Amino acid sequence: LPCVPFSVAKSVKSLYLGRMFSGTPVIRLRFKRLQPTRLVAEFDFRTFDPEGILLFAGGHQDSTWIVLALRAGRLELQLRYNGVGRVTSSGPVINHGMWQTISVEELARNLVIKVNRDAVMKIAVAGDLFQPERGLYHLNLTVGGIPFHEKDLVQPINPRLDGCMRSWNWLNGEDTTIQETVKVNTRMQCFSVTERGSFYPGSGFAFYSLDYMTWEVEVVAHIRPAADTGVLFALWAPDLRAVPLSVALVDQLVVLAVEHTALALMEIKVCDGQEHVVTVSLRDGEATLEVDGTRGQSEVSAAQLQERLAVLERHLRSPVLTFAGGLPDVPVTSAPVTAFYRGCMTLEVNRRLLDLDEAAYKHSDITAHSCPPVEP
Amino acid sequence: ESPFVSNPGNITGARGLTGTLRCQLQVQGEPPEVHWLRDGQILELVDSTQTQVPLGEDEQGDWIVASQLRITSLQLSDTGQYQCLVFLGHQTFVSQPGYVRL
Ligand SMILES: *[C@@H]1O[C@H](CO)[C@@H](O[C@@H]2O[C@H](CO)[C@@H](O)[C@H](O)[C@H]2NC(C)=O)[C@H](O)[C@H]1NC(C)=O
Ligand SMILES: [Ca+2]
Ligand SMILES: [Cl-]
Numbered sequence: 001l002p003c004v005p006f007s008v009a010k011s012v013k014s015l016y017l018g019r020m021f022s023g024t025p026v027i028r029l030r031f032k033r034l035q036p037t038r039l040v041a042e043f044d045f046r047t048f049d050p051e052g053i054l055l056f057a058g059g060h061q062d063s064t065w066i067v068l069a070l071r072a073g074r075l076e077l078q079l080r081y082n083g084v085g086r087v088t089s090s091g092p093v094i095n096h097g098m099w100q101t102i103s104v105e106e107l108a109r110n111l112v113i114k115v116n117r118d119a120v121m122k123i124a125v126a127g128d129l130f131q132p133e134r135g136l137y138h139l140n141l142t143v144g145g146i147p148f149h150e151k152d153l154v155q156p157i158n159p160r161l162d163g164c165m166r167s168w169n170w171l172n173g174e175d176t177t178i179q180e181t182v183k184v185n186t187r188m189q190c191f192s193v194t195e196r197g198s199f200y201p202g203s204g205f206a207f208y209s210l211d212y213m214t215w216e217v218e219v220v221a222h223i224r225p226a227a228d229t230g231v232l233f234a235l236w237a238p239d240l241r242a243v244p245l246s247v248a249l250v251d252q253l254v255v256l257a258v259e260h261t262a263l264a265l266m267e268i269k270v271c272d273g274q275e276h277v278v279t280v281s282l283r284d285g286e287a288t289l290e291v292d293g294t295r296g297q298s299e300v301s302a303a304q305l306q307e308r309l310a311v312l313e314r315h316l317r318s319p320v321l322t323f324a325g326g327l328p329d330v331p332v333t334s335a336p337v338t339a340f341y342r343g344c345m346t347l348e349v350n351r352r353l354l355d356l357d358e359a360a361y362k363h364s365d366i367t368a369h370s371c372p373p374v375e376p
Numbered sequence: 377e378s379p380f381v382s383n384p385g386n387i388t389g390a391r392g393l394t395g396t397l398r399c400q401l402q403v404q405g406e407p408p409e410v411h412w413l414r415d416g417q418i419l420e421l422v423d424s425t426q427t428q429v430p431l432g433e434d435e436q437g438d439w440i441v442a443s444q445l446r447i448t449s450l451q452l453s454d455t456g457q458y459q460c461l462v463f464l465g466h467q468t469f470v471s472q473p474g475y476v477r478l
Binding site (some may be wrong): 019021026027028029030031032033034134135171172173175177178183188364 | 396399400407409417420421424425426427428429430433434435442444448474
């Protein structure tokens with residue numbers, strides 16, 4: 001039973017954009033209209049995620065459409081108008097975790113993108129988004145992704161967007177279907193309140209394919225845990241079914257280990273709901289563990305370290321997968337701790353922030369870019 | 377057995393009235409288009425808004441599908457018996473009707 005409970009509160013009148021595994025949209029709308037119609041869409045938006053797709057509007061792949069997106073915290077519009085594609089990228093920072101209003105609108109020979117009623121993008125275009133046929137005017141709109149493979153965007157992108165919408169309005173329609181069905185499917189609702197990091201409910205892991213070759217492993221982990229036990233970071237060598245390196249919480253301690261042998265331990269107040277910074281550094285003839293600026297005592301002789309680091313060195317010459325938040329059901333004797341992490345965590349490895357949208361594999365219940373607060 | 381979870385209501389009023397009818401269904405797999413019928417004729421020229429929501433974690437799982445038809449200015453030629461129709465494979469399903477007259 002977890003020592004520190006997290007908030008489970010969801011807002012009923014929201015829409016979670018990151019729910020589908022693959023940047024498949026969470027809503028698809030198709031409009032038929034009887035007289036010429038100009039696109040208008042307006043929604044409120046909240047994310048910490050710096051990259052992904054907000055919406056798509058238009059016809060189809062090799063036709064004419066727009067896609068509004070995030071790249072590097074900022075809005076990016078992509079357009080295809082009769083075969084010719086284009087991208088602009090402008091305006092203020094978006095991924096600050098505060099609510100804000102975004103409007104997208106077709107106006108004369110321009111498209112106008114506004115943030116909090118400020119126009120931050122205005123682009124000239126030749127054509128309409130609605131496609132006349134038979135005196136019927138057609139448009140498709142998707143939220144939270146695009147209706148075709150991201151290969152074929154003007155400029156490729158990872159569309160997974162751990163972000164949130166509320167008070168949406170598409171074409172000033174009065175249809176209330178979206179609100180009604182979100183209401184009845186909590187999985188489609190967002191955390192009432194989000195703070196930064198990634199949340200691990202303790203049922204799975206993510207992994208990556210990272211090179212560490214002399215060689216080098218540095219990890220900084222920012223953690224706010226729910227439980228006193230769990231793997232934070234680890235390497236796993238599939239061919240030998242071994243765990244050449246792990247950093248983990250155990251019974252209240254952090255352990256840095258090579259296979260089964262602990263190299264260092266540091267005490268930690270896991271059960272107080274406070275954020276902590278765990279850093280680990282290893283290289284030829286060196287291994288160190290820090291928790292919040294203080295260093296843990298070595299658990300091994302100078303002689304045993306060289307033996308352990310040389311085994312780790314050997315291991316790094318072959319393929320290893322890098323795991324966050326847990327291990328793949330490994331032998332109990334492989335490593336000190338084999339349990340899943342429960343809680344909030346951000347990881348940076350050889351000085352690179354790990355984006356969980358970019359894992360080779362991410363268990364779908366891990367939220368990539370937000371954590372609910374600790375439960376009062 | 378009907379996929380329709382809800383069926384169009386009635387509108388009844390003056391020349392010039394504006395109103396809406398809707399229908400909703402739930403299906404397994406790739407969601408169908410919804411066709412509006414007036415006295416058994418599929419209307420090609422309509423003010424309609426169709427919504428598809430995938431319920432599973434996969435585009436092959438279940439979906440919710442809704443359609444809303446709008447009548448901007450009521451008049452005799454809009455009068456009739458309204459039903460939604462979908463094609464699931466070669467199979468067809470029609471909704472309980474709704475009625476518009478003056
Ligand atoms: C809206 O999106 C749909 C996809 O649902 C487009 O319709 C498809 O178009 C392809 C080829 O381009 C056809 O082979 C399919 O049979 C269509 N599928 C269905 C279910 O209709 C549609 O064209 C888009 N609307 C516009 C205006 O471009
Ligand atoms: Ca993302
Ligand atoms: Cl709410």
